[model samples]
Target: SEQYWRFKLMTEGGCNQNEATRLITVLEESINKLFENDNFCNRLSSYMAYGFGAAEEWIKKQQILSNIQPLTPNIFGAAITFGKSPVVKLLKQNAREICESILMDEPNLKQVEYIFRLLALQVQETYSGEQAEKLYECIRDKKPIPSKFEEILLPIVNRIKENHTEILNESKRNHLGVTIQLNDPYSFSTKNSFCIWFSNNPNSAMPKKIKDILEERAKQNAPGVTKLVYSRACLTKKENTNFVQWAKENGITLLDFDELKCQGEDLELWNLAQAELKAMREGKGGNPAAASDLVRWISGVIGDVPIAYVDADMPMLTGNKSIKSEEVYAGHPVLLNMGSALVKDGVNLPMENVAFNTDIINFTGECKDRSIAIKRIAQSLIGNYLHVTERISKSGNPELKRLGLMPGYHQLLKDCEENNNKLSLPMLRKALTQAHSNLSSYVRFIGVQRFAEMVGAPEDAPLFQEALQQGNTIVLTNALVAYLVHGMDNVSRLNSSEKENLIKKYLGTQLSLLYKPLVMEFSGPCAVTREILPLLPTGEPTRYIENLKQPDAQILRVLQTHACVAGKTNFTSDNIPNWITSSEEVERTQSGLSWMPSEQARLSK
Candidate 1:
């Protein structure tokens, strides 16, 4: 696979043989030739050691910053951060269940010739579990059943003794005059004009129904398939509107068996194919691209974390799975927020709660495992925030164009004109009303832009656009804000301890990830408390914040974008050639005004 790197360079870069070796030679000549700082490891280690608020800065400077821009688009995806990793359970849950049927035989068979044939032809009814057990004990250890023969019967029996599936197929074939087999793409029988089928429109030609199945599964609007069993089967398939009504009554959902089998088959195949399956299922962390791998290399060599990743709803770019695979992880890639890890800078307090799949955070040789894990996750969050910022910026709405008092840590500042605790202020009321939908913008601002500026990177910064084109989470922050914002309904809706447990569950991992850094903004006594007052549970920010002046006590969000961590060496420098600084304007526009469009637009129409 290392050859793949060289090949992509040769074929895709149009790298001819004559120049390829030399360019590769240049590739390894020296880290100094590639980076402004030769020791990128200690540089990043110093930053990670430096604690949060380190997008360091880019003001009062100018230069080519050669080789850096070359790496910008290069360090694109983060395996752990932005990619949609599949829940192996989806692919293998039924897969393992079916393997409960795969015997010493193949897709498989039983050791006992008689049992195998009878069970296959009839379903589990030919003999009861008691009879099978009797045969098993008689031939094997207890001599009730033969060892090899009964063992082969074992897997098949596990499926049958589970009983519902086999029984349902038989019941359907006899009662409804149709044969049905779950998980079998081709096993079915049709009698009379009443065809046995998974499709409601059984007689419909290939073209129309196939198109609907493809697009429906592609869009992921299709209902998830459940295991069909005897208890769920019906006695009849009716015609006319009665068919639709009958189907709804039994909660019958039709699926194209071939496509269903295809998805399962791909899930069991290669890593990339499984990735495509993950994207389609709307599950999350199977980015099988070169970029995240590239990120791992960067991280390994220099400890530059991956920061974040993205599938871009376009993983089918060179993928082997169906074109529908590209459309499956629709809209946003699954994003993990892994920035600002538990380095020397982060306090002994715990870290962000994103899942760190072992495969994602792993590396060999000289490893920056934590850096890559956290980097990619933060990058995922940054890309999502980046695009949402772009969406809010580019939208047609007039309200977003002139964004007003935003509800970020900036709003949390005591100096801020309309702080959140001024509950009666109409401005405060409007901001609270509007904050939920726009929380991403606020977190994006505090998490990166504000943190960066505070650390002295006042102007010119890395552009997140490079990363967004490629890949958390609003989910963590959004969940926290949702708790307090909705706490009003629960104040008397439930009494003290009830609301208490809710707070514990709600803020559980969130405060450290979100507001801890924001509270870090107000460095002096009781200052953070004012900002934190209404939001904190009875357990306090005062308890959370102390020893305000200690150098090691400081913790902040990773201010760098995904590209910065995975791509750059001259991280603290200002005025990046291909980058733009994040500013208050960037924050405000994304946070937008607290008014509903359309409903807040011309009413009812």
Candidate 2:
């Protein structure tokens, strides 16, 4: 009872609703203004494992190993650069779990989450090892997906229900116990020593003296026997240890609650802790408190002060400020060691420790996690400003029934085999044309969300229902779809010449975004290089070159020379385009311009 108390600070900085709302507004505005540096974009570019090459070509060439590129240095660079972004880093450092949840699913909720996690690992490697550790630890410990709503996470809730026995049994088998680490870099508080207490049942036989002592310390909301983690030793099993003496001696107990008791094995526990902590703080789970605290504390501290958490059952903060102060954790011997060791000449190197509430905080990577939710969906068929020729060939016709003409390009692909000769080329061509006609009606959903199926307006969302009711987006308003629809309407004007130019130009734009070049070159495509010329930011000419080839350079090779690599090219060096010659240029334009700032900015940014 030495650390238990309930006192609310009813001031402007404490529990005042008006003050809290203002603070939220300030933080939100600050995030939007975060600097978007071109250099940083240049850095983040490498982390995208999928090269500038077309996704279709990459897949056909088997460029990826199990849908994951090798964890490389570039990935780490992207994480670091991205982690430092005023906005993203703010999200990452402050509300880590929330950032993970949102960004992980921003593209495709399931598979994208996995990919983002992979990138987050690299950020951990470059930044404070502890921050990265925090990311994976939350994920590993089955920490709940940080969210404002307390709606039950169906997946996690179901997992808890199904694995009840195995989870509890494993907690006992693994010798579950608490080990709190102090991350006190600023030394804000003077009280270095603290105490902890345990009880099997909090309501039964409450210690008045113990509770009274803790009540006095409760003003600062110091760490107390917040919850109980189960243990075979059963410190609070009635006959084991007296709660008061245990607190006096600073002993361990089996009365762990929430994630701490479950050793973070319980998603519900992490969710509950996050929820409780958020509730106590008078904020949501994924707010900007933690990262901001880290920044402000670092700015206040002299040199790069070392930060580590104290290992204690329930250490109470003796300061008039937050428990995140220095004193509460400074007394822990192991924490001191880990923190101090990481600090060299004042700089805190990367290192992380297990949570004081659970044993599940220790492992690295997947071992610490039970299972991760993965979502996978098919991508769409849109390139920068145009679609593909093959796709166009298919979409331009509608009368042929042999090439699966009823639905659209995606549905057609689903119907046909990879190398089936049974597919009628002429019929397929017609299907592609009608699919093109239908584009105006269905092109609005071609963003990263629709392609990846990660995050999008839910079916029940007003926007979804409203869009359907209007039928205008699909039939008239959608830009890409509208363009295609108009093209269909004006089929008489395009003729053979215009159709060929549109297809080639669109294909070029698509490839430009898809592949990063491996060599340096001029600013514009030469007359000969017209085929490969990139678009400038000014809607003019911009030539870009890649610095180095990725591990899957084979993908780039496939795109530059032959789309159907299996049928043609077949590792032929002479087939791939080596340099931009005058003949390939759209006009007589040369390939060598010194440098165009607008062009570079557009391409890089």
Q: Go through the candidates in order and give each one's C-alpha lDDT.
A: 0.26, 0.26
**Candidate 1 global lDDT:** 0.26
lDDT of 1 by residue, 109-130 (tens): 2122222222332322344566
- Model 1: which ten-residue window has the lowest total lDDT? 187-196
lDDT of 2: 0.26
Of candidate 2, the 10-residue stretch with the lowest lDDT total is 373-382
